Design a binder for these strands. Sequence first.
RNA 1: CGCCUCCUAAAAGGUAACGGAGGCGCCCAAAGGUCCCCUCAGGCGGGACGGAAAUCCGCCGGAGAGCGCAAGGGUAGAAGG
RNA 2: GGCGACACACGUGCUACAAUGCCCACUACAAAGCGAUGCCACCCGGCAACGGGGAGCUAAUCGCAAAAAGGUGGGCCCAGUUCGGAUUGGGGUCUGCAACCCGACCCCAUGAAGCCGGAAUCGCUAGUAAUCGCGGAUCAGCCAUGCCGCGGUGAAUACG
Lengths: 24, 180, 80, 125, 137
Amino acid sequence: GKGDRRTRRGKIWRGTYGKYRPRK
Amino acid sequence: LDLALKRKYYEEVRPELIRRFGYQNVWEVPRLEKVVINQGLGEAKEDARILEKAAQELALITGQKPAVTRAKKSISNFKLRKGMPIGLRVTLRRDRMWIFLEKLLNVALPRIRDFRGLNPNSFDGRGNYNLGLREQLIFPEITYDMVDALRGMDIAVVTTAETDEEARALLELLGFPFRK
Amino acid sequence: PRSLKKGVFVDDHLLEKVLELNAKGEKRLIKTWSRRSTIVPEMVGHTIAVYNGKQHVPVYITENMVGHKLGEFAPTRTYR
Amino acid sequence: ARIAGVEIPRNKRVDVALTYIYGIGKARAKEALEKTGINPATRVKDLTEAEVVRLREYVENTWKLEGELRAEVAANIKRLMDIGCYRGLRHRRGLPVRGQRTRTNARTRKGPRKTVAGKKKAPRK
Amino acid sequence: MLMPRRMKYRKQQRGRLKGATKGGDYVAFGDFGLVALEPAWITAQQIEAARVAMVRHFRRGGKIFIRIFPDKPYTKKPLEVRMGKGKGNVEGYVAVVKPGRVMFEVAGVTEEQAMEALRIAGHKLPIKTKIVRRDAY
RNA sequence: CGCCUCCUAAAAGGUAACGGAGGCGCCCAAAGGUCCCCUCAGGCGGGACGGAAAUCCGCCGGAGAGCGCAAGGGUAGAAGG
RNA sequence: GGCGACACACGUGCUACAAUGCCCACUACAAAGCGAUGCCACCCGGCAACGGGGAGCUAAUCGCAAAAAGGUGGGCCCAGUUCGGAUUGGGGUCUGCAACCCGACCCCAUGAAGCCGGAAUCGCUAGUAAUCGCGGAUCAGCCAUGCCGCGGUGAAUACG
């Protein structure tokens, strides 16, 4: 949900990182 | 049967009395008084089909056909319109009360509202004791079973007990710790 | 939440004031001005005031918070 | 069967089902399929009684959920009545307990719009 | 201030009669004791008028007890002639008038303030008040 | 304005009057004939949805509950359900 | 303290009404930028954020960059729902001397509202709508969904 979090759907228009986006 | 309470109470709950507390003797101690079960709602002759069904399960669930109590004021009032009936009544005190409860004791119980910490402080003035509840699938056999149904309920036991001192003697006689 | 593991955020004079009273006997209490800083039980019930923008706002300085910040018991404004 | 106290999911695969309890996040479920080895795919209805039990109590034992959670939950709330902390207000004043702006929304902690107004300027506006 | 009333919680029916019946009463409980005179009927209106000077005679207070009870309205019609309707009733509430009926008894202040106080009160009505002691209580 | 309860009515029985506090001109096929059965109202207390009051149990308590609709009388060896 | 105050009423952008919807793995294409006492490849602690180390340029080979929507294949059953974020708590993070009032973010548990909103009122003729996208200035650090800006996809309609 574009306005929530703990997802890569809302974290985009925000540009976070977390264990959700990196690589290793 | 011949197991459970029988070769339990009478084989070991005897020497519980021996030294632990010197009451006196058998014929003159808190064996048990009776076994009480009832129900109350309101809904009814909304069509009366609300009554044909509720009554369809309640009793069979318990494994015995009891007596019925419905209809009083087919008009307004204060505490419900739809017929304004009542509920019902059922009772035991033989190896039958003994069977259904042993199964709800160490089985239906575990799957309960907070395991470690029962409620053994809901006592009367002598050998009376009252508790309220609401369930259907707590029936170790009837797990789930008719979601098309559901409804609340009210049950309580009665004992010869000198006071709620011995009603609580049975609390930790077999378990149900004082809510800690 | 919160940040800064070890050396968090304190004063300097404050280090002293407590020290003494909790070294040579509880005895009395004190008073304070501006705000900011965490808390360490070297002063339970052994508190002061909190002259905010307007005026004072002292408290029993309870433990419970364990060693929580200052935000909790230090407020100010209008109302009603 | 009942994994958590008086609680029952049914007619659905494990991954989903579980997630509707107290302390049950969209992740604690995954911890309970690696050490338990349980495959999410299979539904509840059918599954080895090993998985049914070696999980059921597996959960209610490992820690706390419904009830025990909600309790320690409100406990924090009340324990902020100590003497009356700041975030110990909003708590005791039916209001948002984590800084924001009480000059706009938040009809989520208060309730619906309790309107009731009345300013009467001259009729030139 | 004061303006309300006191005459039964509500209606308690509306009609009674007469006598003389030699009244009576039994001793008391408080210290002093003032008996009455003349057998008849009593007007709560009279009661009030008494306690007034009674009290301001008692600047710091004074203090006294009372034994009685209202009973049933009056008859007297607003002019015409005779019947019953709703007249002569709701305008005068009476109580039993035992000759010698212990009206009030006295306390706190001995036969210094009390006495003359007592009097003025009893000294005022269409009768007289008298003494007490101990006796059988 | 004819009848029903009760005070008035002064203890049998009667007692009037532009006095008193109030009801009826029906309903009923079951509220009727009968053989078996219970107890109440309620007060405290124990308790899902029960704030007096949905409902259930125990101690208690002679009728103040109850009985087609006003009173009176009656009645729990009840007519009462 | 503080104009970032709260009994309510308006504007404007940002989201949920969901099954052309979903969420994971693997995969490919832009322009414009904008890198100095600065952009920080790449491995690793870490489940991760960060943090630790370290080379390029010495500045169009070294930096932000991998990308987005999307393709693939696998997994959902109009249920206010693998929908949804208000929402609270908790535990770590870092600019700053330090974040209660008001920081941003790492992860753990939280699910109102809402099946399209009355009377109404606004852009505009084609790359248009619409959509997915990245960067600028400013800012020590910021909720800047603001504002400047560059492109991946790409309609409809007009008597008068």
